[PDB]
Design a binder for these strands. Structure first.
Lengths: 38, 140, 169, 120
RNA sequence: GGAGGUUGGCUUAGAAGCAGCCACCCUUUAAAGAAAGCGUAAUAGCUCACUAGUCGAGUCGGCCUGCGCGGAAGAUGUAAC
RNA sequence: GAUGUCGGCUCAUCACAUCCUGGGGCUGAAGCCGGUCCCAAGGGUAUGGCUGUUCGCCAUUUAAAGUGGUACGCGAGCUGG
């Protein structure tokens, strides 16, 4: 992961979701652009 | 086969054998290397053999490679129109001494505007932005 | 367009058990797929079906929609058998028990529950047959807990599509 | 030998006459080393020209203790004098001769060169 | 979905739409960025706009403000209603 | 009208911001090793040469020789350099 305080849409396939209380960012292309909380 | 236009290729005219100006040219959006040797050779000896004369090709997988008609070679004979072979080091500010429209007189003679312009006077303004390639401005 | 607001247009090979409080379905090529329907849902019947909410809160707008798609593949799961083409290296299939060799010095065996069944129609592909997609996708994830795809070369089990992030060293 | 600061004779061929244990190898708070165990020595006394010199941190296998070593019937075998055989970083002996007896707890895969030279 | 010529540049296993260097409009005619960049790291597979017949609808971005969510780790024992 | 130092010894107890062991994400992670970030406090977590030392510098270990709080824990338990 990339646990930050500031999660973003780092790419255009990077997508922010809210999964049981935590503001996560999935990326369907690159697993480098995945963040957990912010 | 998927095409998007304006495809660059750096190969010799009339003979598909000299490679290293592009070398291995073809791996991702076209049709392969060695067999371009005949498509150039239904139109020969009127279009400046030897010197560079640039191209926009379009590609087919059906034994056919056909192009965008302009009879008079009018991009590097514009370097011959002024008198250079190496271009200017920066486009349209840094100069060698610019070209005018009275040195566009021989070039606009037989370029056959029917398939590249509207009428013959419109094809004169084709090279009014084609020496807009090489650190020159077309003023007149 | 919203997903529950359109009628289902179901085929006429599957006989429904209209409950109002519940939902049970049955047919040929599979049966026994009853789903306990929740409170905030209406079922309006015709020659086709349609689903609806009850009250203007965003929780049942997610529930009426998830119920039509859960009974979309419950009709189709009795109509057709769900499949997946798991591609790997070496399948020794036997029957209701599955035998595999994924890169280890331990040959791990895997079991198939009731309902589902496993056959090997190709050399090294695994194809699956089941009447509910919830369990069909479940057992294709149970095989990938053994072996993730390697980025550098790629060993063992994959998905059916190819979105595997490959890496060079 | 058994513990650190312990001083012990030299059972192999060339170099030292007395070595002192400066570390018992093995575990972490490991405090004793019997026959077959590996210690860390320093050369306290040596011959005028040999393969080791006085003052040299080396490794040695314990071959012959006064505490002794016990057999499986309960019998003990117990020597009059402490002695080790110095080793290189291969944990292969440096000298080409072994002096005095050794025990059969030493004819393992790593120390049977010491046993094959010993006049046991 | 797909242009009817002839290497758009001092380089030479290999130099587009991503190298210390930069960019705006001329057709057999209803037809379109000599380009802002993930790609089979690169070349022979592929992604944001359609002047459009065809599936048929209420959408896409910002601002003001209400209450909440992460940012939030500590030592005797819940232990900041 | 007294709450008697620093360090060692003996005994600890809690924290987690984890040194080892256990589970993971990403990697400019081929593998062997690592880097970095999560989750995790169950149990472990040196011995000496110098110096009054804490530390430190060194020798050799170890799976590892963690960081803090506890009147810089502890003298009606010791020592007294």
């Amino acid at each position: 992961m990339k646990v930050r305080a500031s999660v973003k849409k780092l790419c255009r396939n990077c997508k922010i979701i809210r999964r049981d209380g935590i503001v996560r960012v999935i990326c369907s292309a690159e697993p480098r652009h995945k963040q957990r909380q912010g | 086969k998927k095409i998007q236009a304006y495809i660059k290729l750096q190969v010799k005219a009339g003979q598909a054998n000299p490679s290293p100006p592009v070398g291995p040219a073809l791996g991702q959006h076209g049709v392969n290397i060695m067999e371009f040797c005949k498509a150039f050779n239904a139109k020969t000896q009127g279009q400046e053999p030897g010197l560079p004369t640039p191209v926009i090709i379009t590609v087919y997988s059906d034994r056919s490679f056909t192009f965008e008609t302009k009879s008079t070679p009018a991009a590097v004979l514009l370097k011959k129109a002024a008198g250079i072979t190496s271009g200017s080091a920066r486009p349209n500010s840094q100069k060698v001494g610019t070209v005018t429209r009275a040195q566009l007189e021989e070039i606009a003679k037989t370029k056959q505007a029917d398939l590249t312009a509207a009428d013959l006077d419109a094809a004169v303004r084709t090279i009014a932005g084609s020496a807009r390639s090489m650190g020159l401005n077309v003023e007149g | 367009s919203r997903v529950a607001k359109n009628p289902v247009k179901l085929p006429a090979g599957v006989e429904i058990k209209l409950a109002g409080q519940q939902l049970s379905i049955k047919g040929a090529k599979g049966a026994l797929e009853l789903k306990v329907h929740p409170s905030v849902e209406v079922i309006q019947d015709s020659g086709e079906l349609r689903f609806a909410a009850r009250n203007g809160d965003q929780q049942t707008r997610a529930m009426a929609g998830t119920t039509r798609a859960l009974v979309n593949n419950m009709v189709v799961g009795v109509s057709q058998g769900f499949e997946r083409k798991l591609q790997l290296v070496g399948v020794q299939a036997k029957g209701q028990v599955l035998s595999l060799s994924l890169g280890f010095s331990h040959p791990v065996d895997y079991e198939l529950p009731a309902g589902i069944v496993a056959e090997t129609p190709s050399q090294t592909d695994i194809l699956i047959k089941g009447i509910d997609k919830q369990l069909v996708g479940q057992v294709a994830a149970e095989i990938r807990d053994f072996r993730p795809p390697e980025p550098y070369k790629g060993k063992g089990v994959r998905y059916a599509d190819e979105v595997v992030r490959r890496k060079e060293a | 030998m058994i513990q650190t600061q312990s001083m012990l004779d030299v059972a192999d061929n060339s170099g030292a006459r007395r070595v002192m244990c400066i570390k018992v190898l093995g575990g972490s708070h490991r405090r004793y080393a019997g026959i077959g165990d590996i210690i860390k020595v320093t050369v306290k006394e040596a011959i005028p020209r040999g393969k080791v010199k006085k003052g040299q941190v080396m490794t040695a296998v314990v071959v012959r203790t006064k505490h002794g070593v016990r057999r499986t019937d309960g019998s003990i075998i117990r020597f009059d004098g402490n002695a080790a055989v110095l080793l290189n970083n291969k944990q292969e002996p440096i000298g080409t001769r072994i002096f005095g007896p050794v025990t059969r707890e030493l004819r393992t895969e790593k120390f049977m060169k010491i046993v094959s030279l010993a006049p046991e």
